Design an enzyme around this catalytic site. Structure first.
Site, PDB file in Angstrom:
ATOM      1  N   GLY A 116       0.807  -1.207   0.000  1.00  0.00           N
ATOM      2  CA  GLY A 116       0.000   0.000   0.000  1.00  0.00           C
ATOM      3  C   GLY A 116       0.842   1.259   0.000  1.00  0.00           C
ATOM      4  O   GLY A 116       2.023   1.265   0.344  1.00  0.00           O
ATOM      5  N   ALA A 156      -0.635   9.139   0.901  1.00  0.00           N
ATOM      6  CA  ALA A 156       0.118  10.388   0.937  1.00  0.00           C
ATOM      7  C   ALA A 156       1.064  10.410   2.133  1.00  0.00           C
ATOM      8  O   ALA A 156       2.029  11.175   2.161  1.00  0.00           O
ATOM      9  CB  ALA A 156      -0.825  11.580   0.984  1.00  0.00           C
ATOM     10  N   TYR A 157       0.775   9.561   3.122  1.00  0.00           N
ATOM     11  CA  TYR A 157       1.604   9.503   4.321  1.00  0.00           C
ATOM     12  C   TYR A 157       2.944   8.827   4.037  1.00  0.00           C
ATOM     13  O   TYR A 157       3.990   9.280   4.518  1.00  0.00           O
ATOM     14  CB  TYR A 157       0.857   8.765   5.435  1.00  0.00           C
ATOM     15  N   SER A 189       4.827   4.908   2.040  1.00  0.00           N
ATOM     16  CA  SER A 189       4.668   3.588   1.452  1.00  0.00           C
ATOM     17  C   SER A 189       4.890   2.536   2.534  1.00  0.00           C
ATOM     18  O   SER A 189       5.667   2.750   3.469  1.00  0.00           O
ATOM     19  CB  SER A 189       5.648   3.369   0.295  1.00  0.00           C
ATOM     20  OG  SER A 189       5.661   4.482  -0.589  1.00  0.00           O
ATOM     21  N   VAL A 190       4.194   1.401   2.399  1.00  0.00           N
ATOM     22  CA  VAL A 190       4.252   0.302   3.356  1.00  0.00           C
ATOM     23  C   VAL A 190       4.622  -0.991   2.633  1.00  0.00           C
ATOM     24  O   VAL A 190       4.146  -1.255   1.521  1.00  0.00           O
ATOM     25  CB  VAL A 190       2.919   0.135   4.124  1.00  0.00           C
ATOM     26  CG1 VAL A 190       3.022  -0.977   5.168  1.00  0.00           C
ATOM     27  CG2 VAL A 190       2.506   1.451   4.773  1.00  0.00           C
ATOM     28  N   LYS A 211       6.902   1.036   7.324  1.00  0.00           N
ATOM     29  CA  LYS A 211       6.426   2.241   6.637  1.00  0.00           C
ATOM     30  C   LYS A 211       7.565   3.243   6.455  1.00  0.00           C
ATOM     31  O   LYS A 211       8.190   3.669   7.432  1.00  0.00           O
ATOM     32  CB  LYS A 211       5.272   2.894   7.399  1.00  0.00           C
ATOM     33  CG  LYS A 211       4.719   4.154   6.712  1.00  0.00           C
ATOM     34  CD  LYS A 211       3.417   4.647   7.373  1.00  0.00           C
ATOM     35  CE  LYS A 211       3.665   5.339   8.719  1.00  0.00           C
ATOM     36  NZ  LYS A 211       2.416   5.485   9.561  1.00  0.00           N
ATOM     37  N   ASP A 252      -3.945   4.000  13.883  1.00  0.00           N
ATOM     38  CA  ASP A 252      -4.137   5.190  13.033  1.00  0.00           C
ATOM     39  C   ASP A 252      -4.729   6.378  13.802  1.00  0.00           C
ATOM     40  O   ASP A 252      -5.763   6.945  13.428  1.00  0.00           O
ATOM     41  CB  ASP A 252      -5.015   4.869  11.812  1.00  0.00           C
ATOM     42  CG  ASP A 252      -4.233   4.257  10.643  1.00  0.00           C
ATOM     43  OD1 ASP A 252      -3.017   3.971  10.780  1.00  0.00           O
ATOM     44  OD2 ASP A 252      -4.847   4.043   9.569  1.00  0.00           O
TER      45      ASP A 252
END
Ligand SMILES: COc1ccc2[nH]cc(CN(C)C)c2c1
Ligand SMILES: [Cl-]
Ligand SMILES: [Cl-]
Ligand SMILES: [Cl-]
Ligand SMILES: [Cl-]
Ligand SMILES: [Cl-]
Ligand SMILES: [Cl-]
Ligand SMILES: [Mg+2]
Length: 347
Positions: A27, A29-30, A32-33, A48, A163
């Site tokens: 997965g 804007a925060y 990539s994981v 992440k 989250d």
């Protein structure tokens, strides 16, 4: 310092310690994981890589905020930090931040839509959310974004909150027929007043109702439609709450609506456990001053089978004074560097 190795995965460079193996993208804007196997602990983990963590003062402070919050959380029903690292050897070359957590699979969305839940399942799931919230609120932290996609669940019905709201959600994200707004308390959805930790209890009420009926409680097509759904269930406000709404224009709008009484919750949640109906009436109160707290809700008779006041811990104190502090980009970056290199892993 561990040995690092580099590799390009989906047009992104990943430089990570050797202990992390078999990286696989999962997965973006925060950041990539990637999923990975951690050979030191034996766990499957999420790694992440933050995107542009120090591009502006706002972004640098958000990076520091997330790292401080994750380093503090040490509770069975809250996501915690397994590791944090940077390949940089000095503050001068510090640019990338990587966060490592337990890899999560299903969320409460999957369960709610795909399973037949007994009343015992609802008791255990909501109990665990309240146990984590008692811990979170004891450190004067507000989650602000509780909703089914932010609750991880495994095959044994065990649950973790994740989250946390980092003050990220935009105006476009909250517009229209969207689950990002269906779980928010009305006083924060419409900026009625300065909010506090009671907004999270409103969210738990919305989640509990959906577990019991299989349906979204307040699926509004926009802010105003959603407010009308809310006031039809809980009633229009009295003069006592109107006093507490700071916007004169919002007060004026509220008084434009025809008055409505609170509905009978036993005729809305047909067939539900009477103790579940009673708890919902105490969470879904319009005036936030009068909602039940997490600590009070754990002692409610609905949870008699699971409540243990000797096994519901509180948090260490959490210093949030940095939030009112005005610093430059490189000063936020230096504070973040200090927290990366001082991390100590769990037992
Ligand atoms: C896979 O998703 C979850 C959700 C909640 C959980 N509570 C405890 C565990 C297992 N732990 C090793 C992370 C868990 C996993
Ligand atoms: Cl290593
Ligand atoms: Cl964890
Ligand atoms: Cl770096
Ligand atoms: Cl959701
Ligand atoms: Cl009227
Ligand atoms: Cl602290
Ligand atoms: Mg989420």
């Amino acid at each position: 310092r561990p040995t690092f190795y580099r590799q390009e995965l989906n047009k992104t460079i990943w430089e990570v310690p050797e202990r992390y193996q078999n990286l696989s993208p999962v997965g973006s804007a925060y950041g990539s994981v990637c999923a990975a196997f951690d050979t030191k602990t034996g766990h499957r983990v999420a790694v992440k890589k933050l995107s542009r963590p120090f591009q502006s003062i706002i972004h640098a402070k958000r990076t520091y905020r997330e790292l401080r919050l994750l380093k503090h959380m040490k509770h069975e029903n809250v996501i915690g930090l397994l590791d944090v690292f940077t390949p940089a050897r000095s503050l001068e070359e510090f640019n990338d931040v990587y966060l490592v957590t337990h890899l999560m699979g299903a969320d409460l969305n999957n369960i709610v839509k795909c399973q037949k839940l007994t009343d015992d399942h609802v008791q255990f799931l909501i109990y665990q959310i309240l146990r984590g919230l008692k811990y979170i609120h004891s450190a004067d932290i507000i989650h602000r974004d509780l909703k089914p996609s932010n609750l991880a669940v495994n095959e044994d019905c065990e649950l973790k909150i994740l989250d946390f709201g980092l003050a990220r959600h935009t105006d476009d994200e909250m517009t229209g027929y969207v689950a990002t707004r269906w779980y928010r308390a009305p006083e924060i959805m419409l900026n009625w007043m300065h909010y506090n930790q009671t907004v999270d209890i409103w969210s738990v009420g919305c989640i509990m109702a959906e577990l019991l009926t299989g349906r979204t409680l307040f699926p509004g097509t926009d802010h105003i439609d959603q407010l009308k759904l809310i006031l039809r269930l809980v009633g229009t406000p009295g003069a006592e709450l109107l006093k507490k709404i700071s916007s004169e224009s919002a007060r004026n709008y509220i008084q434009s609506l025809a008055q409505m009484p609170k509905m009978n919750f036993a005729n809305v949640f047909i067939g539900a456990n009477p103790l579940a109906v009673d708890l919902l009436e105490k969470m879904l109160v319009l005036d936030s001053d009068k909602r039940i707290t997490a600590a009070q809700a754990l002692a409610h008779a609905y949870f008699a089978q699971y409540h243990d006041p000797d096994d519901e811990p509180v948090a260490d104190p959490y210093d949030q004074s940095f939030e009112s502090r005005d610093l430059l980009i490189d000063e936020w970056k230096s504070l973040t560097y200090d927290e990366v290199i001082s991390f100590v892993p769990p037992p």
